[PDB]
Design an enzyme around this catalytic site. Structure first.
Site, PDB file in Angstrom:
ATOM      1  N   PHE A 110       8.672   9.328   6.327  1.00 14.55           N
ATOM      2  CA  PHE A 110       9.354   9.283   5.120  1.00 14.55           C
ATOM      3  C   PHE A 110       9.952  10.568   4.615  1.00 14.55           C
ATOM      4  O   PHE A 110       9.102  11.576   4.512  1.00 14.55           O
ATOM      5  CB  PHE A 110       8.490   8.450   3.918  1.00 14.55           C
ATOM      6  CG  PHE A 110       8.340   6.999   4.014  1.00 14.55           C
ATOM      7  CD1 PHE A 110       7.957   6.230   3.175  1.00 14.55           C
ATOM      8  CD2 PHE A 110       8.770   6.358   5.555  1.00 14.55           C
ATOM      9  CE1 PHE A 110       7.942   5.018   3.219  1.00 14.55           C
ATOM     10  CE2 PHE A 110       8.476   5.072   5.508  1.00 14.55           C
ATOM     11  CZ  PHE A 110       8.039   4.210   4.497  1.00 14.55           C
ATOM     12  N   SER A 141       3.615  -5.031   7.361  1.00 12.33           N
ATOM     13  CA  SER A 141       3.748  -3.862   6.718  1.00 12.33           C
ATOM     14  C   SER A 141       3.634  -2.530   7.651  1.00 12.33           C
ATOM     15  O   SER A 141       2.418  -2.162   7.942  1.00 12.33           O
ATOM     16  CB  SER A 141       2.849  -3.713   5.412  1.00 12.33           C
ATOM     17  OG  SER A 141       3.190  -2.506   4.682  1.00 12.33           O
ATOM     18  N   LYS A 190      -3.694  -2.312  10.651  1.00  8.54           N
ATOM     19  CA  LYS A 190      -2.295  -2.946  10.983  1.00  8.54           C
ATOM     20  C   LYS A 190      -2.405  -3.592  12.588  1.00  8.54           C
ATOM     21  O   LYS A 190      -1.731  -4.604  12.562  1.00  8.54           O
ATOM     22  CB  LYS A 190      -1.305  -1.806  11.219  1.00  8.54           C
ATOM     23  CG  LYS A 190      -0.873  -1.099   9.751  1.00  8.54           C
ATOM     24  CD  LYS A 190       0.141  -0.178  10.062  1.00  8.54           C
ATOM     25  CE  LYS A 190       0.261   0.835   8.717  1.00  8.54           C
ATOM     26  NZ  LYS A 190       1.546   1.621   8.768  1.00  8.54           N
ATOM     27  N   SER A 204       0.731  -1.175   0.062  1.00 11.21           N
ATOM     28  CA  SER A 204       0.017  -0.078  -0.153  1.00 11.21           C
ATOM     29  C   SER A 204       0.924   1.244  -0.180  1.00 11.21           C
ATOM     30  O   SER A 204       0.872   1.950   0.983  1.00 11.21           O
ATOM     31  CB  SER A 204      -1.088   0.005   1.022  1.00 11.21           C
ATOM     32  OG  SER A 204      -0.366   0.822   2.238  1.00 11.21           O
ATOM     33  N   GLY A 260       0.902  18.788  -1.408  1.00 15.10           N
ATOM     34  CA  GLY A 260       0.367  18.395  -2.713  1.00 15.10           C
ATOM     35  C   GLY A 260       1.805  18.802  -3.642  1.00 15.10           C
ATOM     36  O   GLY A 260       1.764  18.938  -4.651  1.00 15.10           O
TER      37      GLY A 260
HETATM   38  N1  LIG Z   1       5.675   8.903   5.907  1.00 15.55           N
HETATM   39  C1  LIG Z   1       5.823   7.532   5.978  1.00 15.55           C
HETATM   40  O1  LIG Z   1       6.387   7.096   6.781  1.00 15.55           O
HETATM   41  C2  LIG Z   1       5.157   6.463   4.917  1.00 15.55           C
HETATM   42  C3  LIG Z   1       4.457   5.109   5.365  1.00 15.55           C
HETATM   43  N2  LIG Z   1       4.107   4.274   4.417  1.00 15.55           N
HETATM   44  C4  LIG Z   1       3.988   2.682   5.200  1.00 15.55           C
HETATM   45  O2  LIG Z   1       4.975   1.712   4.297  1.00 15.55           O
HETATM   46  C5  LIG Z   1       4.581   0.598   4.157  1.00 15.55           C
HETATM   47  C6  LIG Z   1       4.600   0.042   2.587  1.00 15.55           C
HETATM   48  O3  LIG Z   1       3.983   1.489   1.887  1.00 15.55           O
HETATM   49  P1  LIG Z   1       4.472   1.776   0.209  1.00 15.55           P
HETATM   50  O4  LIG Z   1       6.013   1.675   0.047  1.00 15.55           O
HETATM   51  O5  LIG Z   1       4.542   3.159   0.444  1.00 15.55           O
HETATM   52  O6  LIG Z   1       3.358   1.150  -0.737  1.00 15.55           O
HETATM   53  P2  LIG Z   1       3.134   1.391  -2.223  1.00 15.55           P
HETATM   54  O7  LIG Z   1       2.020   2.145  -2.541  1.00 15.55           O
HETATM   55  O8  LIG Z   1       4.500   1.686  -2.959  1.00 15.55           O
HETATM   56  O9  LIG Z   1       2.592  -0.149  -3.036  1.00 15.55           O
HETATM   57  C7  LIG Z   1       3.467  -1.138  -2.470  1.00 15.55           C
HETATM   58  C8  LIG Z   1       3.084  -2.636  -3.110  1.00 15.55           C
HETATM   59  O10 LIG Z   1       2.169  -3.226  -2.492  1.00 15.55           O
HETATM   60  C9  LIG Z   1       1.358  -4.202  -3.516  1.00 15.55           C
HETATM   61  N3  LIG Z   1       0.079  -3.874  -3.547  1.00 15.55           N
HETATM   62  C10 LIG Z   1      -0.549  -2.647  -3.244  1.00 15.55           C
HETATM   63  N4  LIG Z   1      -1.838  -2.851  -3.341  1.00 15.55           N
HETATM   64  C11 LIG Z   1      -1.914  -4.170  -3.253  1.00 15.55           C
HETATM   65  C12 LIG Z   1      -3.159  -4.960  -3.279  1.00 15.55           C
HETATM   66  N5  LIG Z   1      -4.650  -4.887  -3.157  1.00 15.55           N
HETATM   67  N6  LIG Z   1      -3.018  -6.448  -3.264  1.00 15.55           N
HETATM   68  C13 LIG Z   1      -1.802  -7.134  -3.402  1.00 15.55           C
HETATM   69  N7  LIG Z   1      -0.583  -6.256  -3.272  1.00 15.55           N
HETATM   70  C14 LIG Z   1      -0.771  -4.910  -3.290  1.00 15.55           C
HETATM   71  C15 LIG Z   1       2.002  -3.975  -4.451  1.00 15.55           C
HETATM   72  O11 LIG Z   1       3.040  -5.223  -4.535  1.00 15.55           O
HETATM   73  P3  LIG Z   1       3.887  -5.894  -5.657  1.00 15.55           P
HETATM   74  O12 LIG Z   1       5.001  -5.127  -6.121  1.00 15.55           O
HETATM   75  O13 LIG Z   1       4.194  -7.171  -5.316  1.00 15.55           O
HETATM   76  O14 LIG Z   1       2.711  -6.045  -6.920  1.00 15.55           O
HETATM   77  C16 LIG Z   1       2.737  -2.667  -4.502  1.00 15.55           C
HETATM   78  O15 LIG Z   1       3.754  -2.560  -5.685  1.00 15.55           O
HETATM   79  C17 LIG Z   1       3.116   0.731   4.721  1.00 15.55           C
HETATM   80  O16 LIG Z   1       2.976   0.224   5.857  1.00 15.55           O
HETATM   81  C18 LIG Z   1       2.778   2.352   4.658  1.00 15.55           C
HETATM   82  O17 LIG Z   1       1.976   2.526   5.779  1.00 15.55           O
HETATM   83  C19 LIG Z   1       3.861   4.346   3.158  1.00 15.55           C
HETATM   84  C20 LIG Z   1       3.939   5.918   2.648  1.00 15.55           C
HETATM   85  C21 LIG Z   1       4.734   6.984   3.594  1.00 15.55           C
HETATM   86  C1  LIG Z   2       4.279   8.523   9.200  1.00 16.73           C
HETATM   87  O1  LIG Z   2       3.117   7.924   9.422  1.00 16.73           O
HETATM   88  C2  LIG Z   2       2.553   7.483   7.962  1.00 16.73           C
HETATM   89  C3  LIG Z   2       2.572   8.256   6.678  1.00 16.73           C
HETATM   90  C4  LIG Z   2       2.193   7.710   5.848  1.00 16.73           C
HETATM   91  C5  LIG Z   2       2.306   8.495   4.267  1.00 16.73           C
HETATM   92  C6  LIG Z   2       0.971   9.392   4.121  1.00 16.73           C
HETATM   93  C7  LIG Z   2      -0.273   8.699   3.740  1.00 16.73           C
HETATM   94  O2  LIG Z   2      -0.637   7.974   4.759  1.00 16.73           O
HETATM   95  C8  LIG Z   2       1.516  10.333   3.009  1.00 16.73           C
HETATM   96  C9  LIG Z   2       1.216   9.927   1.543  1.00 16.73           C
HETATM   97  O3  LIG Z   2       1.516   8.723   1.369  1.00 16.73           O
HETATM   98  C10 LIG Z   2       0.674  11.748   3.349  1.00 16.73           C
HETATM   99  C11 LIG Z   2       1.183  12.751   2.088  1.00 16.73           C
HETATM  100  C12 LIG Z   2       2.425  13.334   2.256  1.00 16.73           C
HETATM  101  C13 LIG Z   2       2.953  14.111   1.294  1.00 16.73           C
HETATM  102  C14 LIG Z   2       2.002  14.918   0.321  1.00 16.73           C
HETATM  103  O4  LIG Z   2       2.319  15.946  -0.498  1.00 16.73           O
HETATM  104  C15 LIG Z   2       0.825  14.479   0.445  1.00 16.73           C
HETATM  105  O5  LIG Z   2      -0.245  14.988  -0.445  1.00 16.73           O
HETATM  106  C16 LIG Z   2      -1.063  16.017   0.147  1.00 16.73           C
HETATM  107  C17 LIG Z   2       0.193  13.482   1.321  1.00 16.73           C
HETATM  108  C18 LIG Z   2       1.687   6.519   5.793  1.00 16.73           C
HETATM  109  C19 LIG Z   2       1.378   5.890   6.910  1.00 16.73           C
HETATM  110  C20 LIG Z   2       2.191   6.228   8.148  1.00 16.73           C
HETATM  111  O6  LIG Z   2       1.711   5.434   9.285  1.00 16.73           O
END
Ligand SMILES: NC(=O)C1=CN([C@@H]2O[C@H](COP(=O)(O)OP(=O)(O)OC[C@H]3O[C@@H](n4cnc5c(N)ncnc54)[C@H](OP(=O)(O)O)[C@@H]3O)[C@@H](O)[C@H]2O)C=CC1
Ligand SMILES: COc1cc(C[C@H](CO)[C@@H](CO)Cc2ccc(O)c(OC)c2)ccc1O
Ligand SMILES: NC(=O)C1=CN([C@@H]2O[C@H](COP(=O)(O)OP(=O)(O)OC[C@H]3O[C@@H](n4cnc5c(N)ncnc54)[C@H](OP(=O)(O)O)[C@@H]3O)[C@@H](O)[C@H]2O)C=CC1
Ligand SMILES: COc1cc(C[C@H](CO)[C@@H](CO)Cc2ccc(O)c(OC)c2)ccc1O
Lengths: 285, 284
Positions: free
Chosen positions: B143, B109, B121, B85, B155
């Site tokens: 991140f 995850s 989660k 995701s 944005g």
């Molecule tokens: N600010 C932060 O710290 C952030 C936190 N996170 C967290 O990191 C973790 C991974 O997120 P992220 O790398 O961003 O995810 P992505 O949006 O990059 O998706 C990752 C992969 O998950 C698989 N996927 C997505 N949807 C499905 C589905 N319905 N069914 C099966 N597989 C699916 C696919 O794997 P495949 O390659 O095998 O097809 C996809 O490529 C999460 O727990 C998230 O909460 C994420 C964003 C920013």
């Molecule tokens: C640190 O905590 C978490 C953080 C994330 C990432 C979040 C989404 O959920 C990010 C997008 O992926 C939000 C976002 C960031 C920048 C942007 O410019 C933006 O557009 C408005 C939106 C995931 C799970 C977490 O536990």
């Protein structure tokens, strides 16, 4: 140092654009990449673009809806290559208007890399280029390996089928399967080549001119498994994309005209050790 | 040779997953990547997966709707890491891990706010723990690509040119981490006896910064000050905006101490994590 050709790559985060960015850096060109406002939390585009700076490219911000920013961008380079999605092709007309007003550009390579359209939006861009008197090179004649070789020319997948394969007609129509990386390197080599100014360059590496059945037989020799073949006749092949497919595989449109050595990429640049399809297919084993 | 931990990465073509695949390869783990069918129609995904093979990874084909293929995949490894995701998709993964019986550790995850303060989660964690599967929860970071490179503006993912919104007084401590460091920390912790059945907090000390500190890092890099507009908690009336409120107003990444035995940069001090002044340079 200052010897370098300065190239602006438009569409540099695309499948083919990113390859051309890297190929241009690898050739030694001073490489600029158009950065479009397109940040919209597109993490893939952003990090791809900024990965280029680490390799020594530069980013130029401009927008296709901002005519003077396109003019401003092309004034910093000598050569423009575009590789748009292929509504994107016609977006290049704005690019041509900017090059025309700029006046400094020595060559434009528009988004071709496929069927020669001179046999439609690509032709409309050619006419605009030639109308404006902009020197050009048209790079044509190849089937992208990823879309046609890796799937054995099957549709709706990009990897080899495990048991069954559709053969178009008898599968004895010659096709040109080219690794997109080689297309990008030929493009980087040809864009300042005096021999190819105002020419069409055909990408037809000799050993990659193959029938579909020859491609399938390369795979079967690698896996040692015979696939079950179903022949599909021209008529059973009763939207436009299936039409592209019909022209390549039923009419032989990539191979039905011979090309001279002075106009074929692998003869012009014999140092490019292009990927043969037995090598290309090994990664899927 | 064969003393390496074998690791299966689920979600290997996503933002974090791809980083985790490479970090496992770089750590010397025999690395496997789940290859899902819907991957077949996506050239970004396909080129990504197959590029892992050139680096020495193997691909395992399996589908989440096919329990037996999941079981067969997890029997080829010792540890499983998932980075999705579609969080709930991991429930099917857990039943598979449960049936196979050979998995020494599952890292679900996580990689964000610790959900156990704050949901889907937690459901996954309950299932992990109910099945007796040993685990490690990697949490605690923002991140850098989503919050640092844009100076925490929304944005956009790149630094702004003139204006910048400061949240509250920009005095609340946030944890900004290069996703590469998260992945390497994950690759290092997944077979580490100190972290079995623990939460690992990714909180590198020099990267605990208020937003105003982050902005000033950028101003020192450009030589220019930006126009700051402060936004009160209340103007902060999207559930991503809720995440943002927790981070930059409540300080939920930093309102609790974490011990050295549970913090990644103390566990793995040889990781020269990327400081935010280095991270932002790429945008100059
Ligand atoms: N600010 C932060 O710290 C952030 C936190 N996170 C967290 O990191 C973790 C991974 O997120 P992220 O790398 O961003 O995810 P992505 O949006 O990059 O998706 C990752 C992969 O998950 C698989 N996927 C997505 N949807 C499905 C589905 N319905 N069914 C099966 N597989 C699916 C696919 O794997 P495949 O390659 O095998 O097809 C996809 O490529 C999460 O727990 C998230 O909460 C994420 C964003 C920013
Ligand atoms: C640190 O905590 C978490 C953080 C994330 C990432 C979040 C989404 O959920 C990010 C997008 O992926 C939000 C976002 C960031 C920048 C942007 O410019 C933006 O557009 C408005 C939106 C995931 C799970 C977490 O536990
Ligand atoms: N078998 C063959 O011979 C193949 C040939 N081709 C051809 O190669 C060329 C490149 O194709 P391809 O790699 O698939 O293109 P992509 O789909 O990968 O798009 C590449 C770039 O086009 C830009 N783009 C797309 N849509 C827009 C839009 N509305 N407005 C502005 N820019 C847009 C983007 O620029 P930016 O990066 O700056 O965001 C994008 O990165 C085409 O001429 C195509 O016909 C393509 C398929 C296979
Ligand atoms: C070779 O010359 C050209 C090639 C192209 C690319 C064509 C048509 O768009 C590709 C798709 O991009 C066809 C395709 C292939 C495999 C597939 O599994 C598939 O699924 C839908 C579709 C464009 C213009 C050309 O001149």
């Amino acid at each position: 140092s200052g010897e370098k050709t300065r190239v602006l790559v438009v569409g540099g985060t695309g499948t083919m654009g990113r390859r051309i960015v890297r190929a241009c850096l690898a050739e030694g060109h001073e490489t600029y990449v158009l950065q479009q406002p397109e940040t919209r939390v597109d993490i893939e585009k952003v990090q791809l673009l900024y990965s280029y700076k680490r390799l020594g490219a530069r980013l130029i911000e401009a927008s296709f809806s901002d005519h003077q920013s396109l003019v401003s961008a092309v004034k910093q380079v000598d050569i423009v290559v575009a590789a748009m999605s292929g509504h994107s092709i016609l977006v290049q007309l704005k690019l041509v208007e900017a090059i025309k007003e700029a006046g400094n550009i020595k060559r434009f390579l528009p988004s071709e890399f496929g069927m020669d359209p001179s046999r439609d939006q690509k032709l409309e861009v050619r006419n605009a280029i030639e109308a404006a008197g902009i020197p050009h090179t048209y790079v044509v004649g190849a089937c992208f390996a990823a879309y046609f070789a890796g799937n054995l020319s099957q549709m709706g997948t990009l990897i080899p089928p495990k048991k069954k394969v559709n053969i178009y007609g008898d599968g004895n129509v010659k096709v040109v399967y080219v690794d997109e990386d080689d297309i990008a390197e030929y493009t980087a080599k040809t864009l300042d080549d005096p021999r190819t100014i105002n020419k069409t360059v055909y990408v037809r590496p000799t050993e990659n001119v193959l029938t579909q059945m020859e491609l399938v037989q390369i795979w079967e020799k690698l896996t040692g498994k015979e696939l079950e073949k179903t022949n599909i006749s021209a008529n059973d092949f009763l939207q436009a994309g299936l039409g592209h497919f019909y022209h390549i595989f039923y009419e032989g449109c990539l191979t039905d005209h011979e090309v001279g050595d002075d106009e074929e990429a692998s003869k012009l640049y014999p140092d490019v050790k292009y990927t043969r399809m037995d090598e290309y297919l090994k990664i899927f084993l």
